[PDB]
Design a protein around this ligand. Sequence first.
Ligand SMILES: [Zn+2]
Ligand SMILES: [Zn+2]
Ligand SMILES: [Zn+2]
Ligand SMILES: [Zn+2]
Ligand SMILES: [Zn+2]
Lengths: 90, 90, 89, 93, 93
Amino acid sequence: GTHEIVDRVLTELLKIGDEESIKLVTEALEKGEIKSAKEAVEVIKKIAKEKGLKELLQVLYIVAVEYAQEKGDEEIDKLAHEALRVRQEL
Amino acid sequence: GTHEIVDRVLTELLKIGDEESIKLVTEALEKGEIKSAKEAVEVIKKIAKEKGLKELLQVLYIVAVEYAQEKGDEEIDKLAHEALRVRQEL
Amino acid sequence: THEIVDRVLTELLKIGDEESIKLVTEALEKGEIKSAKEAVEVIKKIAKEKGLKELLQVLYIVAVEYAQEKGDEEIDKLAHEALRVRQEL
Amino acid sequence: GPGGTHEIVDRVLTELLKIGDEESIKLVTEALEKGEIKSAKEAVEVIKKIAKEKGLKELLQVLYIVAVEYAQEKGDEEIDKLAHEALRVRQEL
Amino acid sequence: GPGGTHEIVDRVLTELLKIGDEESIKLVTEALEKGEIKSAKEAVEVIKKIAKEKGLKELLQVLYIVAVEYAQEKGDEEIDKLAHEALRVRQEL
Ligand SMILES: [Zn+2]
Ligand SMILES: [Zn+2]
Ligand SMILES: [Zn+2]
Ligand SMILES: [Zn+2]
Ligand SMILES: [Zn+2]
């Protein structure tokens, strides 16, 4: 759950070589800050808004919206769209 | 249903950085208008024909034929081919 | 029923082959393609006459993956003919 | 049998088209039409030797990828061995 | 056994071909051929170690992706933990 969102975000960040978001996301994971898939999205969303990381929010939208689709989870879908909104409003 | 079409369109728009189409599509989604995948294709195709958005229609054709293929939806398949006809007539 | 032509147009789009999209969509409009086999035959014939190597490339890939998916030996045979027609242009 | 034959050969041909390698395409399609390839294992073996003879590191790369993924799919340990062989041939060129 | 070893090693090689990392391909094939690997988990540890000692950032990126997806497939928390270690080792290189 936690790792399912986080690990995929990490993988997608490596593909675009966003090394700073990789560092920040992994820290949040290791700080014990993530206990659910839902928690992963809000934490990663918050981090990206604070540091102005448009590509992190793009990755986050894609990963969460597919996780929500795959699991039938309406809450994750909401956070994914809200991530893009943060991305727009940067 | 609705989000099945819209969310993949947004994901594909993100992959090519079509920031203009992303604005319009999430705007259409947020406006509570779209109640079905068929309405999703209709609204996006009409947006993109009005604005002359070749890349949106291409993404629309692909997302909608593959959705119509998966679920057996003759109406959506028709709408995808109409998306493509408008694009070629741009 | 026309699974093959849909996958062909998606691939033609990526390479921006608007002429093949046109000619392929025309064949679809007229009711010509009602099965996988007729999909490959009609598209291969159209690519042979109009001299479209890129269409035959796309058709081979699409047809051969379709054949593998469904275990359809006649489509496989058709896919390789389209490749041969390409190699002789 | 031809089931495994075309799974190897057709995916190799698909990948060669993607990189535009007409030289390999002609070499593989002619070996297939000449009856040189009657099983998955022979496909790998024939394409591997063709590529070694002509120094086609790009064809061995495709062959390795297609063969090891087929070997994992079918649990075929002989395809897997040939696949690693293809990679070694590529590496020694 | 050899199944899990090759599921890890073979995909790493596949991904290394895609980025053209011939230095890593050689070091990985060398470790495979030397019977130094009995399981998927050992494959990850040995590849992670080589990549640390030779400073191979790209091998570690490939290793994380291969190992973390294998771990998800197999419900294998030990291999997941290795995958994140591989990313940390890359961060310090
Ligand atoms: Zn993990
Ligand atoms: Zn959604
Ligand atoms: Zn259609
Ligand atoms: Zn074939
Ligand atoms: Zn192997």
